[PDB]
Swiss-Prot record, chain A:
Underlying gene: PPARG
Post-translational modification: Phosphorylated in basal conditions and dephosphorylated when treated with the ligand. May be dephosphorylated by PPP5C.
Subunit structure: Interacts with FOXO1 (acetylated form). Heterodimer with other nuclear receptors, such as RXRA. The heterodimer with the retinoic acid receptor RXRA is called adipocyte-specific transcription factor ARF6. Interacts with NCOA6 coactivator, leading to a strong increase in transcription of target genes. Interacts with coactivator PPARBP, leading to a mild increase in transcription of target genes. Interacts with NOCA7 in a ligand-inducible manner. Interacts with NCOA1 and NCOA2 LXXLL motifs. Interacts with ASXL1, ASXL2, DNTTIP2, FAM120B, MAP2K1/MEK1, NR0B2, PDPK1, PRDM16, PRMT2 and TGFB1I1.
First-to-last residue of the parent protein present: 235 to 505 of 505
Keyword Translocase: no
Organism expressing this protein natively: Homo sapiens
Designated name of the protein: Peroxisome proliferator-activated receptor gamma
Function: Nuclear receptor that binds peroxisome proliferators such as hypolipidemic drugs and fatty acids. Once activated by a ligand, the nuclear receptor binds to DNA specific PPAR response elements (PPRE) and modulates the transcription of its target genes, such as acyl-CoA oxidase. It therefore controls the peroxisomal beta-oxidation pathway of fatty acids. Key regulator of adipocyte differentiation and glucose homeostasis. ARF6 acts as a key regulator of the tissue-specific adipocyte P2 (aP2) enhancer.
UniProtKB/Swiss-Prot annotation, chain B:
Crosslink site: Glycyl lysine isopeptide (Lys-Gly) (interchain with G-Cter in ubiquitin): K19
Protein name, as recorded: Peroxisome proliferator-activated receptor gamma
Motif window: 9aaTAD: 253-260
Entire protein: shown range: 235 to 502 of 505
Organism: Homo sapiens
Disease: Defects in PPARG can lead to type 2 insulin-resistant diabetes and hyptertension. PPARG mutations may be associated with colon cancer.
Keyword terms, alphabetized: Activator, Biological rhythms, Cytoplasm, Diabetes mellitus, Disease variant, DNA-binding, Glycoprotein, Isopeptide bond, Metal-binding, Nucleus, Obesity, Phosphoprotein, Receptor, Transcription, Transcription regulation, Ubl conjugation, Zinc, Zinc-finger
Species lineage: Eukaryota, Metazoa, Chordata, Craniata, Vertebrata
An annotated Gene Ontology molecular function: transcription coregulator binding
Subcellular location: Nucleus; Cytoplasm
Length: 260, 260
């Protein structure tokens, strides 16, 4: 246990890093998804023709799939930058640094994807675009079904009503998982996470006092996260045996080589 | 400001510098001179014994590369320590977040070189928080590109250490470097220079009181930031060559990400 002032200090630290590391915060995403801003209004893609006009303003299922893979790579870069700032992370064994990231980036991506989503769609191109869930759900053969459970998770997850400051600590807890497969020094990983959890517990208590057992309930959502990554990796594997024309990113190839 | 305030600011920064960096200059100096002897790497065999005995954090391809990379992991590790320290400089965290990021982005190299001198003498360099000592003859003698990559760090430390600065001098000098208002892309230079003029004020008084016998040490120390900039460009231009010359450098995709 740390003194509560130390945890408050840790939380502020991490919020600052998160702000610096991720250009599109939940705070900015919500201001776009709600409205009353002629300054911030997205272009909305709901069919093939509006997609064709989307390029001029900012095969189809592949074009969209590949574009998602490059946004994903962009996010691993941002998450890796953030992780580097978590107190203790860079002092870990170098091999374990990779393993935490190998197993953490996806669970973090979906968490952060939820900030860019509502029941009806998802922000793209750094807020400038909005692609509707119904349009994606209607893409051919294997795709389309690739996007829907993220929406199903995002709707429930977003009802916790967390903000960027809450999320910064929650992301950290994810990265610092000492039960990831193949870690060499689990002990120093748990000790760090024991601090992030303490920081998160306090942060949640103060920022959401009317919201009973949010800490518990937020920890339970990592159950949902694990399954989404399972279903997703099973899906990517099918496209790999179906589409031999297209490829993955070197960085992406690494995250999904082995893994539970 | 009143002299008591500069004495206070200097006391403040020394206190912060102590907590932020594991191995002070005072402690390194006690190690490099004499009076638990550090494990000494002076050739290929003693390095092989360095791991599996003291099992070093950064060194675990082939030998010269392994060492070259190990320096970069320590550098990344140190950047977090400097970032922690910067957060305590009065006023720093109250600046525009983009500018905090810019000041660190362009400052860490000069601070790393500066502090590297505290761990160096003419004959070698401390590693692993003092537990190791790697000889300059060994580093200087690594093959083709790598040998010459390490020797200038030593060439700098020897001249710099002839000023005979201590941690209380160095804490302010570091602060002055961070708060450099000529870094590219700053949005609000005024408050950065305002802070720098105070750190300079504290630095000038500190040197006068701590080194009264040493005329124009303030001046001579400002002249060394002329040196630092040229050494950092030389270094960066040198890394550029190794990246384009050595194809034996294949690290894990996620590692290259962390260590870029
Ligand atoms: O303890 C520390 O504070 C500490 C800080 C920096 C280095 C260190 N970094 N680099 S660098 O990555 O090229 C670099 C340098 C300046 C700016 C940017 C990047 C070095 C290159 C040569 C040398 Cl001799 C040292 C360094 C450090 O080396 C300890 C070490 C030496 C040999 C094997 C393993 C570890 C220690």
């Amino acid at each position: 246990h740390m003194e509560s002032a130390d945890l408050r200090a840790l939380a502020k630290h991490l919020y600052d890093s998160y702000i610096k590391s991720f250009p599109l915060t939940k705070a900015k995403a919500r201001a776009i998804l709600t409205g009353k801003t002629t300054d911030k209004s997205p272009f909305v893609i709901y069919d093939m023709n509006s997609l064709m006009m989307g390029e001029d303003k900012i095969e189809v299922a592949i074009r969209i799939f590949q574009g998602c893979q490059f946004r994903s790579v962009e996010a691993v870069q941002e998450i890796t930058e953030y992780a580097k700032s978590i107190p203790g992370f860079v002092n870990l064994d170098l091999n374990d640094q990779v393993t935490l990231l190998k197993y953490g980036v996806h669970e973090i991506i979906y968490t952060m994807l939820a900030s860019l989503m509502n029941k009806d769609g998802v922000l793209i191109s750094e807020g400038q675009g909005f692609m509707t869930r119904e349009f994606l759900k209607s893409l051919r053969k294997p795709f389309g079904d690739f996007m829907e459970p993220k929406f199903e998770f995002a709707v429930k997850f977003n009802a916790l009503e967390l903000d960027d400051s809450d999320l910064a600590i929650f992301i950290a807890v994810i990265i610092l998982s000492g039960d990831r497969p193949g870690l060499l020094n689990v002990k120093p990983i748990e000790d760090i996470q024991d601090n992030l959890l303490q920081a998160l517990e306090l942060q949640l208590k103060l920022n959401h006092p009317e919201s009973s057992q949010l800490f518990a309930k937020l920890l339970q959502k990592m159950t949902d996260l694990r399954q989404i990554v399972t279903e997703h990796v099973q899906l990517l594997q099918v496209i790999k045996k179906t589409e031999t024309d297209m490829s993955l990113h070197p960085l992406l190839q690494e995250i999904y080589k082995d893994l539970y």
